[PDB]
Specification:
- This is part of a larger assembly, with two copies of chain A.
- Chain A is α+β, with helices and mostly antiparallel strands and 97 residues long.
- Chain A contains two helices and six strands; from the N terminus they run ββββββαα.
- The two termini of chain A are 16 Å apart.
- Chains A and B meet through loops of A and helix 21 and helix 35 of B.
- The complex binds chloride ion and sodium ion (NA).
- Chloride ion (CL) binds next to loops of chain B.
- Chain B binds three DNA and RNA strands through strand 1, helix 8, helix 12, helix 13 and helix 18.
- Chain B: This is CRISPR-associated endonuclease Cas12a.
- Chain B: InterPro entries: Cas12a, Cas12a_NUC, Cas12a_REC1, Cas12a_REC2, RuvC_1.
- Chain B: It comes from Acidaminococcus sp. (strain BV3L6).
Chain lengths: 97, 1292
DNA sequence: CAGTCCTTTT
DNA sequence: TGCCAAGCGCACCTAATTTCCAAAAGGACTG
RNA sequence: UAAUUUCUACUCUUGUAGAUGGAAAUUAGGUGCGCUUGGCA
């Protein structure tokens, strides 16, 4: 996910830093291994579990890359060609998507 | 007295109805066998090829005439000058007269009746002109006399394809008379020369004069431009702007040359454009020196001329040659791409940009012309780079940094090409990174594009997009290379300069390719069009009269409530013309229309009597009477007196009212008028077609004031319709043998399952053939009907597939619509294909939705999935009336004076509403008020805005644009409907803004539609015989002629100036009287402050009061003293208040500009802040103004004045919050400031509503001043000062 | 021609 | 988030203004 | 996410509600893209 830093300034904290742009990466959810030998899943996120409205007691494991694959295949978007997905995601204004 | 129901049958209104024709019996088979569709399609194509060829005749003859024209333009100039300086009726009429003189002078060249030519040329011209609008075009005579030009075999093949069928062009003939006419009509060459272009050319002369007087240096600059353009070599710049030269600017070739003197000439894209006069002027203004202000204060923009009617345009500017096929563009670009690969441009480019990392950045320069483009690309703003450069240089200066030095630095930055080392130093290393990042993207995308293979056609949008993006990428590289200043003026690194110029040259064709590809790809594909049918009958359906049935081939039938069109074709074989024999009305069959018409008496009578050849031939050498016997049961006498009466030397005829105006012979007028009418009655008594018409309803000839009044009463008597029965046998056999084509005239109101109200058009048609209408004609059937064939334009695709469920757009309410953002979700859910869990809002609506399973397959766009026969037929309503009304506005005004209780509907174009209505009673109180953004539960404003954005997006994406006029009509049809119901219910005047004083299209379109509707208003529900029914339409507006001829009144519709209708207090009439442009310095602001009498705090209320007399601060006002001598302007305590619904707001709040977006501002709070910072005592009730002034703190003065301006800003808008309120800074008589936020329904609920309200009230001003006037004449406009004075006195 | 039917007119 | 002025080229969409809304006189054809 | 002389909005209703002056000719303008010289503190 490419973001130019001189862009979407309405949602920034006003901290440009030094860099003009970032390649934000949804890391593939594959198994990697630490030095001791322990396995972990790359790209894994730990996010609060949310009950309707605003309720958060426990937390849950999320795998962004895999969930994105889920969402694209749901909507039948072709992505393994290397093509830009963003226009296709908001081409129909699906609120869930 | 008068009555509302008395607004009917005041003038004729013509309309066209449109139906489908459904062939019956073997009609379709016979049509196919005879091959008529192909034959008529072929005629249409032959017409289209031939039209340009024939047009060559007119274009040449017109230019040949126009080259010889030499007039003196002084008199016309003078008349224009008179009417401009003094705005009277007599000066107008003089201009109108002069205009018509000049037109006739131009026209005299065309018809061979000008003294400026010899008798031989005038003889040749009149001879050509005599044959321009007849079949003499198609014979070659007019082309034989015009040049030794001739036609190719193919052209002759076309010309002969209209043999025995030249009448197909009889409308074209009219269109071309409209070119050579001397009348004051837009289509005409003389009008274009006299009333369009000459004024402009005159104005240009004036501009030139005044400019070179103020600034004589310009004279030679302009001459130099002409030298650089290479036109008008034998004519000095002075002569070009002299009246005699305008005789040399009548032909297109010369007009375009003239226009390019103003306009300049472009070469290939990327090369410097040659500047014209208007650019040179603009450039000179933008220097902002002294010469600039002198020029800026004068008119500084020459006016280009409009084109000559018919003429092909020419241009000296470069035109890019077109691609012809998908295949050609793909091949070319594919080759160019391969060149770029083999040339190694991306690998060179990458190496060049690398060079920048380790080379003296002092010897790399950025073009001054690109500094801002680079800024946007690499920085937050466009001015980032400039500003950093500015601030750095300032910091480098030596000595005391004067203002002149800073000025000098600023001036240096305008022109200088900046080295890359300085740019980096000024902006930071961040800039180096942004540069490297950007070059990476551009190279990355360029590489991607050269590798990505091209499509095989451009037939699908996805393919065009592949093409577009590849060009975009390459254009990106071209743009990047063009960042660098390469010229040898700067000390550029020699290698860098050579290498850049190298790959720039290799990339340059991208421009050419980009443009050509777009110009091709954005073309609209040939869509199928309906074409006119003739069935081998040149005069098909030209007219319905019994006597013409055998020539025109069209008849009408009725049978059991259904209507049929009878077409009688000319078949390929030898067949006796079809005859129909009536029978007893008992026998089964079809009721045939017998239509009996004698057209416009004014023309037909002379055509059949006085204007006969034998009559003209007799009176040429005789004075004895001639008796006509043919088509007269008894002989009609034409005497010389009568002949000479309709055939004068003199311009006006003795019986036209124009002879009464020109002379003073009211005796001889009425005597001539009587003798002519008498003679018409003699004709009518004797002529075969009229002798049996009872004319006893006519009055005695002597009692008619104008000939028009006579002919108005006469024509209604000269049209009759009746029916007789033809037997089933005659009709069915006729169809069988192919001697008759029988079609049902059809629309959906004739469907087996029709059970609702009919279309208005259906009602007109049924009303036309109703018994009442047959007995007394209100609606007439007109001739010149047309038949069309429309081929299938879409593919059959059912809006369903198996057991699909369809979701109603509305809930069980049959009122509430499902949100656009939820529909597809709910749709997919009820068809079990959601693919995710249903949203909470969707799940809430779910219980109240309606579905319908698909039992019957209905076809999307069905009407266009198969060929259709169409039929257009014209009608006239209010046939008993004259063709145009007399003193329509006076009749309304009469009615209004006797009906002071008449309510007013104000209609306004708003900032946040397309249209806003406010209905007032006759006391200026609001009855109703609402936005018309939504009608029938549909948000048209949102739909329109979205569709407009799509169309822009399309344009940018080289995608199909499409139309929005249909959506606009959809909307305005609903609006028109609601205004019409309001007018009728209230019996009300309607008031709109005059737009002569954005989204002005939707409101202009509205104006038009509203008037056209009110010209002939029929309400479906009303019975036929009730006023407002189909046989008695309401006519509430004046007959529309043109917008040009439109005044400030069209019957019950009134136009008022928009100024001071929104930003004005509904309770007092107060308006901000100050011009904030004229308050700009510490000096101006302080004088401004000194003008107020006092500002003091009121501990009781918490408010500050600022007292102003209107007679002070005149320098800062708009010269509008209104009615009040003084105002107590109020800073309202910023306290919580509650509206009617119980929602709060903060009093006195303002919303002021930020442009980041807007900011909330609380003046009273901020004033307290200022005074407390300054330590100025105020809570005692003392005058604050001396103390702010004696202190003479400029920042305190500024703030105070900024605050005053805010308080006076009544209108406060913020799209984000949806706020758009009016809060008045002055208390009304009852001691309260208006605030729309209180949501009192007695008053304007928002700012747009306030607008409508005061639009309406300006109308009221017109109705009040009309009553007081002893005339029936409405006052001409409303000056702002009159308005303010009116409303201010009224409210207080 | 004498009649038919397209063309042109007020 | 950068627009604006003067102007040239291309694509297409939109609106305003003119004529007609005709039976019969006139005459060019065509055996 | 459909039925129309045609348009828009609809679907109890194989259809509903409202609107609807055509055809031809011409002219003017708009939106977008590209390009030119300039302007802005
Ligand atoms: Cl206003
Ligand atoms: Na209906």
């Amino acid at each position: 996910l490419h973001f130019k830093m001189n862009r979407n300034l309405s949602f920034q904290r006003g901290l440009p830093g030094f860099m003009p742009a970032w390649d934000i990466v949804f890391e593939k959810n594959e198994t990697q291994f630490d030095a001791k030998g322990t396995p972990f899943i790359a790209g894994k996120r730990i996010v609060p579990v949310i009950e309707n409205h605003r309720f958060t007691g426990r937390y849950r494991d999320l795998y962004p890359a895999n969930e994105l694959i889920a969402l694209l295949e749901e909507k039948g978007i072709v992505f393994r060609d290397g093509s830009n997905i963003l226009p296709k995601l908001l081409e129909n204004d699906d609120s869930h998507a | 007295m008068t009555q509302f129901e008395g607004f009917t049958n005041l003038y004729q209104v013509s309309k066209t109805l449109r139906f489908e024709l459904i062939p019956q019996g073997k009609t379709l088979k016979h049509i196919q066998e005879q091959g008529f569709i192909e034959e008529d399609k072929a005629r249409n194509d032959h017409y289209k090829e031939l039209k340009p060829i024939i047009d060559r005749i007119y274009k040449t003859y017109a230019d040949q005439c126009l080259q010889l024209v030499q007039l003196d333009w002084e008199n016309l100039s003078a008349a224009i000058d008179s009417y401009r300086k003094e705005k009277t009726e007599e000066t107008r009429n003089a201009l109108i007269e002069e205009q018509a003189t000049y037109r006739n002078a131009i026209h005299d060249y065309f018809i061979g009746r000008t003294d400026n030519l010899t008798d031989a040329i005038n003889k040749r011209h009149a001879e050509i002109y005599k044959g321009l609008f007849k079949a003499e075009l198609f014979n070659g005579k007019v082309l034989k006399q015009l040049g030794t030009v001739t036609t190719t075999e193919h052209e002759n093949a076309l010309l002969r394809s209209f043999d025995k069928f030249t009448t197909y062009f009889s409308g074209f003939y009219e269109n071309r008379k409209n070119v050579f006419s001397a009348e004051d009509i837009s289509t005409a060459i003389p009008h274009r020369i006299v009333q369009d272009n000459f004024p402009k050319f005159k104005e240009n002369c004036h501009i030139f004069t005044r400019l070179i007087t103020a600034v004589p240096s310009l004279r030679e600059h302009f001459e130099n431009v002409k030298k650089a353009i290479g036109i008008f070599v034998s004519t000095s710049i002075e002569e070009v702007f002299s009246f005699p030269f305008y005789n040399q600017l009548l032909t297109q070739t010369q007009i375009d040359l003239y226009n390019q003197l103003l306009g300049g000439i472009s070469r290939e894209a990327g090369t410097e454009k040659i500047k014209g006069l208007n650019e040179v002027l603009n450039l000179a203004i933008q220097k902002n020196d002294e010469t600039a202000h002198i020029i800026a204060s004068l008119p500084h923009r020459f006016i280009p001329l409009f084109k000559q009617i018919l003429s092909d345009r020419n241009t000296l500017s470069f035109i890019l040659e077109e691609f012809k096929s998908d295949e050609e563009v793909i091949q070319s670009f594919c080759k160019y791409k391969t060149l770029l690969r083999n040339e190694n441009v991306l690998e060179t480019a990458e190496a060049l940009f690398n060079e920048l990392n380790s080379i003296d950045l002092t010897h790399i320069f950025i073009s001054h012309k690109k500094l801002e483009t680079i800024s946007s690309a690499l920085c937050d703003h466009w001015d980032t780079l400039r500003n950093a450069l500015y601030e750095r240089r300032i910091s480098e200066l030596t000595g005391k940094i004067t203002k002149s030095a800073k000025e000098k630095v600023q001036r240096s930055l305008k022109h200088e090409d900046i080295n890359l080392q300085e740019i980096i130093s000024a902006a930071g290393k961040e800039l180096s990174e942004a540069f490297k990042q950007k070059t990476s993207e551009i190279l990355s995308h360029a590489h991607a594009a050269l590798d990505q293979p091209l499509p095989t056609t451009l037939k699908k949008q996805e393919e065009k997009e592949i093409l577009k993006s590849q060009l975009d990428s390459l254009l990106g590289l071209y743009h990047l290379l063009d960042w660098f200043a390469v010229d040898e003026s700067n000390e550029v690194d020699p290698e860098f300069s050579a290498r850049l110029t190298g790959i720039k040259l290799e990339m340059e064709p991208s421009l050419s390719f980009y443009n050509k590809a777009r110009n091709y790809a954005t073309k609209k594909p040939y869509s199928v069009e309906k074409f006119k049918l003739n069935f081998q009958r040149p005069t098909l359906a030209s007219g319905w009269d019994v006597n013409k049935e055998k020539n025109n081939g069209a008849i009408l039938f009725v049978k059991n409530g259904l209507y049929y069109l009878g077409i009688m074709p000319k078949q390929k074989g030898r067949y006796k013309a079809l005859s129909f024999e009536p029978t007893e009305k008992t026998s089964e069959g079809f009721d045939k229309m017998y239509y009996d018409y004698f057209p416009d008496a004014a023309k037909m009578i002379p055509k059949c009597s006085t204007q006969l050849k034998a009559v003209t031939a007799h009176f040429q050498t005789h004075t004895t009477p001639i008796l006509l016997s043919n088509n007269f049961i008894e002989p009609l006498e034409i005497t010389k007196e009568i002949y000479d009466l309709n055939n004068p030397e003199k311009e006006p005829k003795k019986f036209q009212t124009a002879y009464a105006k020109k002379t003073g012979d009211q005796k001889g007028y009425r005597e001539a008028l009587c003798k002519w009418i008498d003679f018409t009655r003699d004709f009518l008594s004797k002529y075969t077609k009229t002798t049996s018409i009872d004319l006893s309803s006519l009055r005695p000839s002597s009692q008619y004031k104008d000939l028009g009044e006579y002919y108005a009463e006469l024509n209604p008597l000269l049209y009759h319709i009746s029916f007789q029965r033809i037997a089933e046998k005659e009709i069915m056999d006729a169809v069988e043998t192919g001697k008759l084509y029988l079609f049902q005239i059809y629309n959906k109101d004739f469907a087996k399952g029709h059970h609702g109200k009919p279309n208005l058009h259906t009602l007109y048609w049924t009303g036309l053939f109703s018994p009442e209408n047959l007995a007394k004609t209100s609606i007439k059937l007109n001739g010149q009907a047309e038949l069309f064939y429309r081929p299938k334009s879409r593919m059959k695709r059912m809006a369903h597939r198996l057991g699909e469920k369809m979701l109603n757009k509305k809930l069980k309410d049959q009122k509430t619509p499902i949100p656009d953002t939820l529909y597809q979700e709910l749709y997919d859910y009820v068809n079990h294909r959601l693919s995710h869990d249903l949203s909470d809002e969707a799940r809430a609506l779910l219980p109240n939705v309606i579905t319908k399973e698909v039992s019957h397959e209905i076809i999307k766009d069905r009407r266009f999935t198969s060929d259709k026969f169409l039929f257009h037929v014209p009608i006239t309503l209010n046939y008993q009336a004259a063709n145009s009304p007399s003193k329509f506005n006076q009749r309304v005004n009469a009615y209004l004076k006797e009906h002071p209780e008449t309510p007013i509907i104000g209609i306004d174009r708003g900032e946040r509403n397309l249209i806003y209505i406010t209905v007032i009673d006759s006391t200026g109180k609001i009855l109703e008020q609402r936005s018309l953004n939504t009608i029938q539960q549909f948000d048209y404003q949102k739909k329109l805005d979205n569709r407009e954005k799509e169309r822009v997006a399309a344009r940018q994406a080289w995608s199909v644009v499409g139309t929005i006029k249909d959506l606009k009509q959809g909307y305005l049809s609903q609006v028109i409907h609601e205004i019409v119901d309001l007018m009728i219910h209230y019996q009300a005047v309607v008031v709109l803004e005059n737009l002569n004083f954005a989204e002005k299209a939707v409101y202009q379109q509205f104006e038009k539609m509203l008037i056209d509707k009110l010209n002939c208003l029929v309400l479906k529900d009303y019975p036929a015989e009730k006023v407002g029914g189909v046989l008695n339409p309401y006519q509430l507006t004046d007959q529309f002629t043109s917008f040009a001829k439109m005044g400030t009144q069209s019957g019950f519709l009134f136009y008022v100036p928009a100024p001071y209708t929104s930003k004005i207090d509904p309770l007092t009439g107060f308006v901000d009287p100050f011009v904030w442009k004229t308050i700009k310095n510490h000096e101006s602001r302080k004088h401004f402050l000194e003008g107020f009498d006092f500002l003091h705090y009121d501990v009781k209320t918490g408010d500050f009061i600022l007292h102003f007399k209107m007679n002070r601060n005149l320098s800062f006002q708009r010269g509008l003293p209104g009615f009040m001598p003084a105002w107590d302007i109020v800073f309202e305590k910023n306290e919580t208040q509650f509206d009617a619904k119980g929602t709060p707001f903060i009093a006195g709040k303002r919303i002021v500009p930020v442009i980041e977006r807007y900011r909330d501002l609380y003046p009273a709070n901020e004033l307290i802040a200022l005074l407390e910072e300054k330590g100025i005592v105020f809570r005692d009730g003392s005058n604050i103004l001396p103390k702010l002034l004696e202190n003479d703190d400029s920042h305190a003065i500024d703030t105070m004045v900024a605050l005053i301006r805010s308080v006076l800003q009544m209108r406060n808008s913020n799209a984000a919050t949806g706020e758009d309120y009016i809060n008045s800074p002055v208390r009304d008589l009852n001691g309260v400031c208006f605030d729309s936020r209180f949501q009192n329904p007695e008053w304007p609920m928002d700012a747009d509503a306030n607008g409508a309200y005061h639009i309406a009230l300006k109308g009221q001003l017109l109705l009040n001043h009309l009553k007081e006037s002893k005339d029936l004449k409405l006052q001409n406009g409303i000056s702002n000062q009159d308005w303010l004075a009116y409303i201010q006195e009224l409210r207080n």
